[PDB]
Amino acid sequence: QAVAPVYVGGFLARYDQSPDEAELLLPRDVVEHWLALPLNINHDDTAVVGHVAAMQSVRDGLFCLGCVTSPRFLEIVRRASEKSELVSRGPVSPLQPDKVVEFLSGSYAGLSLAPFKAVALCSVGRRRGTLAVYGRDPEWVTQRFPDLTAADRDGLRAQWQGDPFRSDSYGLLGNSVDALYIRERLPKLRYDKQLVGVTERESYVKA
Amino acid sequence: EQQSQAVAPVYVGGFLARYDQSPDEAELLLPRDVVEHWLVALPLNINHDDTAVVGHVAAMQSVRDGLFCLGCVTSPRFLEIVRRASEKSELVSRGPVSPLQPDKVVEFLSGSYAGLSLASTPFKAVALCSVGRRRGTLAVYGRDPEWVTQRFPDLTAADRDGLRAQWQRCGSTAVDASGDPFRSDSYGLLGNSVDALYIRERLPKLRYDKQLVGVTEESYVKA
Incomplete structure (x- = not known):
């Protein structure tokens, strides 16, 4: 089923990466201290598509696994994916x-962390190393990241084991044009791929 | 009343080919002598998709620096889709x-379909696309045909007279016969938008085009 749930995994932050804007700093202790959150599209709370199913602070950063479940959103994506x-x-x-998964991979290739608040799927994250990896199996999704250990995955697995989407295709289309003008989007995405060791050769990543 | 101005017609102009640009790929070659020979309004579609006709070509003219065209976006359904997306x-x-x-609609079109692409009797159609494969094919959107042609420094007063005679002469067209020619929807445009995100060097190409045609000197161009 195309509209079956879709899992998405990735780092919300890379501890060894120093951001340009001080506003994006996210130290390890801060994360471990304050450690279900909604999952939305580009920080639009009228665009919740699911929830965060797991969050683990690991060696290199804060890893997250989300679950895209909104039928309304998944149907829009299914239809768009056909074109x-x-x-x-x-x-x-x-x-x-997998059309739905591939469309999501292409459109929202990054993650953004907004206690907490929410995790947004976006065309590309402002923090580096935030590549979004989509898949039907959460186990498979976490296995795409070489940095994670079996113990890391054990902690995550324990966690993930009305329709909230109040937007429409028009909203996603409007967001799509904004994406076209984010400077260095592809270079940033490729840099992220390299940092987290994920390749298009073993995932649905499009960048 | 206000949303009404949004869905009014939108004119678009730009070069379909630059005689001064040498393409790396042979299939993109389009010499002046050929254009003149080849040179009933051609349809205007979204990225060469026959189910996405949004208007017609109002004028085409071979000038000193290339083949220039002026199109008119008329589809009520396409314009309404664009209007809704532009608000977001x-x-x-x-x-x-x-x-x-x-001008939300004009700005959304300027941002999304910044390039023009000719569908090679000889001339079959013109496609609005994220960015053209031929360099210098920047798409310039506006509500007035005259204003649009005036965005291009290369065009002379005589060049504009020829184009004007063409679009003022262009009344109703076959493409936009007895109804909306658009046979697509927001989902179709959304699917096409993901494709645009992976076109390599999109912005640099668009920036190069803008400078090549002198539009860098004011308009709704977003690149």
Whole structure:
């Protein structure tokens, strides 16, 4: 099923990465101290598509696993995915094509952490290393990140084991044009890929 | 009343090809002698998608520096989709460069479909796209055909007279026959938008085009 739930994993922050804006600083102790959050689209709270299913502070940063569950959102995505050349091209070599997952991978390639508040799926995160990895199996999703240990995954696994989306296709389309003008979006995304060791050769990542 | 001005027609102009630009790919070659020979309004669509016709081409003219065209976006359904999406754009909310009146629809089109692409009897259609494969194909949107043509420094007063004779002569067209020619929807445009995000060097290409055609000197262009 295309509209079945979709899991998304990735780091919300990389501790060894020094941000340009002081406003983006997120030290380890701060995270461990203040450590379900809604999952929305680009910080629009009228665009909640699911929830954060797990959060773990690991060696390199704060890892998160979210679950996209909104039927309204997933249907919009399904329909849009059918009109995407990128999606039609499919994944690399062995991965099974999955239109909904691939469209999400292409559109919201990054994560952004807004106690806490919420995690937003965005075209690219302001913090580096925040690549979003989508998949149908949460176990598979966490396995895409070389940095995570079995113990890391054990902590995450324990955590993840009305329709909140109050937006529409028009809203996502308006957001899509903003994305086109984020400076250095692809370079930033590729840098993130490198930092977290995730490749398009073993995931649905499009950057 | 206000949302009415938003869905009024939108004119778009720009070069479909630059005679001064040597393309790396042979399939993109379009020499002046050829254009003249080849040179009933052509349809205007979104990224060469036949189910996404939004208007027609009002004028086409081979000038000194290339093939220039002027199109008219008329589709009520497409214009309404664009209007709704434009209300949810941070880019559009920031508005245009000072003197220009904010125009959500025009700004959304300027941002999304910043390029023009010719669909090679010889001429079949013109496509609005995120960025053209031929350099210098920047798309300039506006509510007035005259204003749009005036954005391009290369065009002479004589060049504009020829284009004008064409669009003032262009009354009703076959494309926009007895109804909306658009056979797509917001989902179709949304799907196309993800594709645009992965076009390499999109902004640098758009910036290069803008300078090449002198539009850098005021308009709704977002790049």
